[PDB]
Amino acid sequence: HGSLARVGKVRGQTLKVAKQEKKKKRTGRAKRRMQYNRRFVNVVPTFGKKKGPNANS
Amino acid sequence: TVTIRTRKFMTNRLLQRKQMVIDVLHPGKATVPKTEIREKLAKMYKTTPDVIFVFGFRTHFGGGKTTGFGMIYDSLDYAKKNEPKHRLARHGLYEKKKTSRKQRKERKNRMKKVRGTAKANVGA
Amino acid sequence: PVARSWVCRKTYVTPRRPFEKSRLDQELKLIGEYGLRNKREVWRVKFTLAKIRKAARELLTLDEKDPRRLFEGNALLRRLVRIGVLDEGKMKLDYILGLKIEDFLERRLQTQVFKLGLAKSIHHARVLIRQRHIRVRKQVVNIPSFIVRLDSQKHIDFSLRSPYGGGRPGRVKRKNAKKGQGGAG
Amino acid sequence: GKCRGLRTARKLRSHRRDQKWHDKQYKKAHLGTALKANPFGGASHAKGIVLEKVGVEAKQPNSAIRKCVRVQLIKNGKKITAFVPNDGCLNFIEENDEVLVAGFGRKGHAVGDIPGVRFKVVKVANVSLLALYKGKKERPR
RNA sequence: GACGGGGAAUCAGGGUUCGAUUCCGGAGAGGGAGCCUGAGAAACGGCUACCACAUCCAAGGAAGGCAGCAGGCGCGCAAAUUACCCACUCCCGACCCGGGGAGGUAGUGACGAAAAAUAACAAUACAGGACUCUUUCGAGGCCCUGUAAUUGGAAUGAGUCCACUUUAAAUCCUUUAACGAGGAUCCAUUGGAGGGCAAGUCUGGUGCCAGCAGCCGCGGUAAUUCCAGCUCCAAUAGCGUAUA
């Protein structure tokens, strides 16, 4: 415990993990090209409500 | 292989000079220096290459065109009279005093410091 | 007092709604279709067309048989025909309001190079314009937002100092030839 | 409008001025009281010196303590109460350390569940609190 | 918390706010007062009286006013080189010929405005898409569409680096030699992911504690909102906060 209202308690006690090494992301014009690509021209005519890009249920 | 064309050519009898806007064509090469331009203007005007003065050459984007001005005189002394002194210094025919403005102004205040013939003596 | 200009103005306008689906999808579709960099360029084209439409509505507000209305209408009509987004058959002031933004995006240099047949894709066309390989009437262009005229569409071609249009080979070709001559001798 | 006479502009003008004075925002912006009692005095940011660190409580429907400091100003010397925003940034603030306070969001009004605090701190020891959070800059020694 | 105006922002139409600020006019050189010269001054880079402040001093006296250009202190959230030149524009003088911190030039400069790099092509990788078909199985995949640290070739730009050009001499831009990129490590950030409002009921930790939150609200030992990683959404060399 120590005390109740300690400053920096949760962030101090939070486990420290680092980044994962990855390639750089495409920036500038090709970011918009890939966004238009994935959003419009690689779709299939599904039914019902659409699924979000972060749906991981 | 460079070519020179003329534009807005006009003469001044009251300035004893000829004025024109020259067009320089140098494709596939960097900007030509002013000495070759002067020698070519001396060639096509049948003039000695000492009264030939060119200035202000701005290069276009892409390479091949450069717009400049040329000045054509008759004789050496009539060229020397009605000329800016910096173009004469570029040709090498004039030399200006080499001192900077701060010591000139301070020396002028030192002449202000005293009075008489010693005003020239205190400025050394 | 210094002798400068102090004159400048904005060329784009930010829309009032920042996050809604349909206009975001329409702008994103236009960016993807014409290979542009960001939303500021299509907002700039929309701003220019909005100013042209506002001027056309101001001229159409004023009544017929006036000198300034006929003068400015004929001037704006002649400019809008000569820029290449109108036809001589449609030589009327009330047809300015029917224009769309894609017509203004048609006369851009990037899509004109892409549609003429000098590049594979429109992104290849943009990285050809930015690369200084072509010229418009014996003078190279580097800017992809080069609007062209009706008499200037035919004269576009490759530049002299370019390996695609005939000239000195580039750096990588000369490096590979030097590597081949080093490996051979 | 009610007065619709052809030669009536004065009654419209004076009535519009009186009913504009019978307002809240126009009454606030055009009197010397709302700027004379203002701790910032028509300023966006201000510097100050911390003297005490006091933790004030929350409102009714939520339960927490809120980390705050007592700051005296430099230009006029009055006592205000600021609010350190982030998690665990009170350890960077020591006694008699100069800070940079700013507004809190609702134009001189209490925001959220913190009672009676209208200011928050941005920079301490002439460095930003965000750089102390992210491990970018270090306090001078 | 008033220099005025020509103006600026915002704007269906009507309006609201600002205008110290380069052009015009007015006022002052700490504050009042008086005056000489001169055509024109109550001039302050002219003089004189006062107080406030202040320099040197053998103590008797002598010398001053950066709200000019740089620069220093103080102040405050808040604002730059103790640089070069009269060559460009004009002004003044006995005057083509001398002077000009007026001015011009460069440096600092993410106030702001305009343009515009951070990739593309070719083949393999493996899923679909239009055409007579094989009900549904292989296939023309020759006509495509896409991304996976698969490979190989065409390209130029930042930066280093001669020259030329520009300029009073430069520097900057442009022209231009020889150099200069495969994960092209030459590595794009800023604020968010409950609703407003584009985008996870993903995983681990705390457990009305830490904290998030402009508003509604979220945390009570299974947090779609906290603290960290992955995925992603918005603008993009830009983004967020506070104020009028």
UniProtKB/TrEMBL annotation, chain B:
Record-given protein name: 40S ribosomal protein S24
Keyword Ribonucleoprotein carried by entry: yes
Biased composition (Basic residues): 98-116
Region (Disordered): 87-124
Assigned protein family: Belongs to the eukaryotic ribosomal protein eS24 family.
Alphabetical list of InterPro entries matching this protein: eRP_eS24_sf (IPR053709), Ribosomal_eS24 (IPR001976), Ribosomal_eS24_CS (IPR018098), Ribosomal_uL23/eL15/eS24_sf (IPR012678)
A GO MF label: structural constituent of ribosome
KW Ribosomal protein (keyword) present: yes
An example Gene Ontology biological process: translation
GO CC terms: cytosolic small ribosomal subunit
Domain of life: Eukaryota
Keywords (A to Z) from UniProt: Ribonucleoprotein, Ribosomal protein
Bias (Basic and acidic residues) ranges: 87-97
